[PDB]
Amino acid sequence: TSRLFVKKTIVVGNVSKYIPPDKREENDQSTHKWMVYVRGSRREPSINHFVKKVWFFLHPSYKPNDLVEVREPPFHLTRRGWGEFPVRVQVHFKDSQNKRIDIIHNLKLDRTYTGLQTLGAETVVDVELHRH
Amino acid sequence: AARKSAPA
Ligand SMILES: [Cl-]
Ligand SMILES: [N+]
Ligand SMILES: [N+]
Ligand SMILES: [N+]
């Protein structure tokens, strides 16, 4: 409905934990566990108001689970891995008028190698959507 | 082309 919008903040981040050989089974090449999350800003952190679902596109190595739909919050994706790669985060909005957006998030894996969770990276974008 | 590399 017409020409008014709101600017909204969307944050895509990633955290990672290193998995020591002492904690992987015989045939498990996963050196890391990571968690990509999608969130709003400090002012309002819950994007459930205006977000319908999130599509996570991943590297072909994750086939057949390279495409993941998180419908209801928290919009998080946890997986095991060995490699860094651009994660394509595709957001769909509850309002039919606002078209979907892709956010390319560069996954950053931990290199402290202490086996503890660390903060990898963060991608921040401003989104426009029909207010009314 | 889809590229993936390990940190270490
Ligand atoms: Cl380096
Ligand atoms: N915001
Ligand atoms: N964990
Ligand atoms: N879900």
Numbering used by the authors:
A (entry chain A): 201 to 332
B (entry chain B): 24 to 31
Which of the paper's sentences describe this entry?
The YEATS domain of YEATS2 binds to acetylated histone H3K27 (H3K27ac). Taken together, our results identified YEATS2 as a histone H3K27ac reader that epigenetically regulates a transcriptional program essential for NSCLC tumorigenesis.
The overall structure of the YEATS domain adopts an immunoglobin β-sandwich fold between eight antiparallel β strands. YEATS2 uses an aromatic sandwich cage for Kac recognition with the acetylamide group of Kac clamped by aromatic residues Y262 and W282. In the complex structure of AF9-K9ac, the N-terminal motif “K4-Q5-T6-A7-R8” of H3 contributes to binding whereas in the complex structure of YEATS2–K27ac, the C-terminal motif “S28-A29-P30-A31” of H3 participates in YEATS2 recognition. Notably, H3P30 at +3 position is anchored at a hydrophobic pocket of YEATS2, which promotes proper registration of H3K27ac. A recognition signature of “Kac-X-X-Pro” is unique to H3K27ac but not H3K9ac despite that both sites share a consensus “A-R-Kac-S” motif, which explains the binding specificity of YEATS2 to H3K27ac. Analysis of the peptide–protein interaction using LIGPLOT program also revealed that the H324–31K27ac peptide is stabilized by a hydrogen bonding network and hydrophobic interactions involving a number of residues including H259, S261, Y262, W282, G283, E284, F285, and Y313.
